[PDB]
Structure formats: structure tokens, C-alpha cells
Design a protein around this ligand. Structure first.
Ligand SMILES: OC[C@H]1O[C@@H](O[C@H]2[C@H](O)[C@@H](O)[C@H](O)O[C@@H]2CO)[C@H](O)[C@@H](O)[C@@H]1O
Lengths: 291, 293
């Protein structure tokens, strides 16, 4: 079993203690996107045996115009999620159930369906973390994200009252500072912080520091060692700066992405696996093993 | 009236004869979960006229941290159970009173309260079948489930001495083979077997075969035609394989679930009922209608 997660001030506690966890985020679960082969019990086990990962994020794709997402293949995506969640539980790892969307607030009925479903099927497990809105775009925290979050949090809690729920923030989950000015009034809520080392520097970390200073807990559910588009070279200086920042603030994180697509963010070289890591994968392996 | 259910060897006898019954299992009775609307006398009557169902399972939600369960709304869940039980008696159908939990052994005070109340109110009826622990998880049969079971069975039996009590087994009630190695020394006790056609096949039937061969009777109080992930299509051939295994061994069963949630296991389409069945609903209706009721 894993320790239950709760929020106290700007800290997420595990079994009542200050600590943090590191693991990989699976790539989009979308049918046709190539990462389906990774949504397996075998891969979840490998994340643990190879990197000593303590968590794994299931990025269940959502989007009314996003091919192969929940809007086009509910069954396939939900089946992949089920496989990963059950494996995570069996491996004593946390599983971040991510409604991987950039438009959750405009397709609310689908979001509610997704969350009532996951809360019903997996809510009893302390391993389960709900990530209700991956990456909101340049929208309003108070008027777009917050109302949607309150609605979804309440729908989830009518089924599963105990849990840590991580809420996306404006501008691809960078504006944790804006969210911190008007936090959500519900128990155990953390806020999403996303960054890509080759694009987001100190100024982005400053925004995260502001959020922590304002009293909200952060969870970096997705981050890359490369550029913001998921490609390019590994920026060690910025990656190390960000990891140091996370370590000294007990911020848990999931790296993008356990996949083999021909892009720098992939942990594996194209058609490769755990024995053929990319430059990003090699760095991520050390970070996770050393966490 | 319905025949008295007893256990002899690995067989459940009705009035002393070998036979089995089939019917639908209602979804979680929980307040706010959308299935409360199905816990009605009309639904029980319709399960009989539409599907020829001879039983109906009332899945009364339980969970200290399970929203809308008996722990949060005692009266609401109990009232729904009451409506279904009385209708079952009025329709000459068996009613499986299911303490729908994944944690009964860790909240025994609630389990005892629930069972003493139900045994006191409905124990006089032979229609009543007690299912004391829906689905134990990764726990011990000998160290966790069995002690819990003996305690609850004794609490029930002190009030209602005649009835069939079905006990959950490890790993979502799949480990009947494990339970068969150390059976409970109480009269008329059957053991729970749960499976989903799209996920569990011959290896799971083999575990059940091990249990039967070891001397214990089984009752498949919950089963689905689809994948265990609740979604997906109906696996016709595997469902038939399981139904043949049940028919030949006279194992009674309740299908999951008489509900309208948009998932493969629901018998009905969203906002639908008896005249608007899902692919699973059509298959389940076929099985129940031709079972023997
Ligand atoms: O290859 C599948 C799909 O990828 C899309 O880009 C991804 C990118 O690979 C991933 O790293 C990032 O996190 O998300 C984007 C999608 O927003 C690409 O845009 C699609 O054409 C392609 O089919």
C-alpha cells in the first residue's frame, strides 16, 4: 500500500509527513498516437524496476477536435487507463489519472462522465490522484477554470470523498501565481505546474515561488528536459535548477514522456525501450532514481 | 412462495432438489450514484415479466469513505432495500441482500448492525439470501474473511436460523479455490464467484472447478458480459462458456447491472429501461429468459 496524500498549507503530505515523489508521465493515450503500446502492466512495472519510480501518470487524451481522444474512442482510452491504474495499485505506486485536455471547461459533460467513472471504479485506492484539467490555455482562472473545478471536485466527492485533486492553471499550467490569488475552497486541492527546461527559466520558477508564498500546494504533473514543444536538446542547467526547486519544496513530479515518438521528450529512442534511452531519458532516469 | 435453499456437498438445493436461478443485480444503491431510481416495486415486477427473472440482487452500498453509502445515508439505502425486498416476496422471487462492500471486515460494527436489522425484518422469508461481503480485495481468506464471516453468520443465525448465506472470497471474489481449502463449519453456506466475460476465461472457471471439487457450493452473485473495465463489447462466446459451466453445475447467478449508466455493463441505454436495452442487456435477457424461470 501507499501512504494517503493530503494537503496542509502549501504542502502535500504522505501519511502525515513531508516528502515527495517522482515518476514518468505516459504520453497521450490517444488511439493512433503510438503510445498505446506503453499503457501496460509491463511498462508500469518497468518504471519501478528501471527508474525506481514511485508514481506514473496516465494522460488520457481529451478534445473534441483531437484525434483518437476520449471524444472518438472512449472504450480504447478508458481500457488503457484501467490497465495502468490496476498495475500501479499492484506495484504500490501512485497513479495520476489525467483528463489530458486543453478544453475541459467547454466539454464539461464529458469531463463529469470521465470523473464520475474513475471515482466509482478506482476511488477506494489511496494510490489514485485526480488531475481534472491538464492544461488550460490563456483563459480565466476565476471565471473559467475555478467554476469548472468546483463542479468536477464536487461530482467526484459525492462518490469518493477522500483524495488529492490537482487542478490545472492558466497558460498551459504556468500561472500558479494567478491561481494562488484566489484558491479553491475544498479540502486537499493542489495546483498544476508545468514547465519545459529548454524554454521556461527563472521567471517561471518565480511564479511558482509566488504561489507557494501565497499558501497553495503545487504538483508538477508534467515537465520536460527539452523545449516546450516536446523536442530539442536537454537543458541540464535549467532542469537541475527546477529539480532543486522541487526538492526543497516537496513538489512531486511526472516527466514527459514515457514514449518512443521521434521527439526529444521521449524517454526512448524510436522503436526503443528501457535499454535505449534518449538524452532526455538518461537524465530523467538519474533524477527519478535519485529522488 | 419459493423453495427453501440449503447446501449439501457442493450443491445448493431448492426444496431438496438440484436446480439454479438467474436474475439481474441492481447497481450500487448509493445516494447520488444514479441507480436509486431503480430500487422500486415496479422494477422487481418487471424483472420477472420481462426477463423471467427468479431472483434480484439489492446491492446496498457500504464504505466508510464511499460516498452515499450506508455510512453516509443509512435511512436512504435501507429504505431502497426495503422496497426491493418486499416486492421480491410479493412476486415470489428470491432476493439477494448484498452488503456491497470492498471493506466489510474493517467496518464490522456496520456489517453487524445491517445484518441484524435485515434478519429481524425479513428473516422469516425463504426468499431472503444473505450476501455478507460483496468483494474482498487482496486479503486473507483464513485470517481476514473467514473470521469476519463466522462473526456475521452467527449474528444473522441468532435471529434467522434458516437461510443461505453467501460469503465473498479473495481478489474480487475470484479465489473460491483458496476458500475451499478452509471452508466454514456452518450450515448452508455458499461462496461467491464473480467474473466478467471479456476478462476472465477458462483459468477462472478452473479455480471455480477446484472449489467445487473440494466440496464447496458457489453462487455467482455478480458477473458481466463485458470487459472488467466496465466498457467494451459483449464477449458472446466467453459468456456462453460461463453460462454452460453454471447450468451444468447448477450455479445461480445475478448479472451486473440493472442500471442506465453509459457503460457496457448497464442493461439499459442512458435514460432507458426495459424497452431500450444495450447489447449486454439483450444478451442477458436471452440468458435469463431461457434459464428456467
Ligand atoms: O504524434 C501524435 C500527435 O502528436 C502531436 O503533438 C504532441 C507532442 O508530440 C507531445 O509531445 C505534446 O505533449 O502534445 C502534442 C499535441 O498537442 C502532434 O501535434 C499531432 O499531429 C500528432 O498526431
Amino acid at each position: 500500500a501507499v501512504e494517503k496524500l493530503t494537503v496542509s498549507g502549501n504542502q502535500i503530505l504522505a501519511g502525515g509527513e513531508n516528502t515527495s515523489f517522482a515518476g514518468p508521465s505516459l504520453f497521450w493515450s490517444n488511439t493512433g498516437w503510438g503510445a498505446e503500446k506503453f499503457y501496460t502492466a509491463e511498462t508500469v512495472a518497468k518504471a519501478k524496476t528501471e527508474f525506481n519510480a514511485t508514481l506514473i501518470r496516465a494522460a488520457i487524451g481529451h478534445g473534441t477536435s483531437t484525434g483518437g481522444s476520449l471524444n472518438f474512442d472512449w472504450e480504447g482510452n478508458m481500457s488503457r487507463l484501467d490497465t495502468v491504474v490496476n498495475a500501479a495499485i499492484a506495484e504500490d505506486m501512485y497513479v495520476i489519472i489525467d483528463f489530458h485536455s486543453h478544453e475541459a471547461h467547454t466539454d464539461q459533460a464529458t469531463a463529469v462522465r470521465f470523473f464520475e467513472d474513475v471515482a466509482t471504479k478506482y476511488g477506494q485506492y489511496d494510490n489514485v490522484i485526480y488531475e481534472i484539467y491538464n492544461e488550460p490555455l490563456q483563459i480565466s482562472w476565476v471565471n473559467d477554470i475555478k467554476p469548472y473545478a468546483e463542479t468536477v471536485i464536487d461530482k467526484i466527492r459525492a462518490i469518493d470523498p477522500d483524495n488529492l485533486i490537482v487542478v490545472g492553471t492558466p497558460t498551459w499550467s504556468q500561472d500558479v501565481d494567478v491561481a494562488s490569488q484566489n484558491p479553491i475552497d475544498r479540502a486537499n486541492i493542489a495546483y498544476t505546474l508545468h514547465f519545459y527546461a529548454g524554454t521556461h527559466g527563472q521567471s517561471y520558477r518565480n511564479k511558482a515561488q509566488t504561489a507557494l508564498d501565497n499558501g497553495i500546494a503545487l504538483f508538477a504533473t508534467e515537465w520536460g528536459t527539452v523545449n516546450a514543444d516536446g523536442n530539442g536538446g536537454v537543458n541540464i542547467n535549467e532542469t537541475d535548477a527546477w529539480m532543486a526547486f522541487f526538492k526543497t519544496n516537496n513538489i512531486s513530479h511526472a516527466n514527459w514522456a514515457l514514449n518512443d515518438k521521434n521527439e526529444g521528450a521521449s524517454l526512448f529512442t524510436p522503436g526503443g525501450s528501457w535499454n535505449s534511452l534518449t538524452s532526455s531519458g538518461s537524465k530523467v532516469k538519474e533524477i527519478i532514481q535519485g529522488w
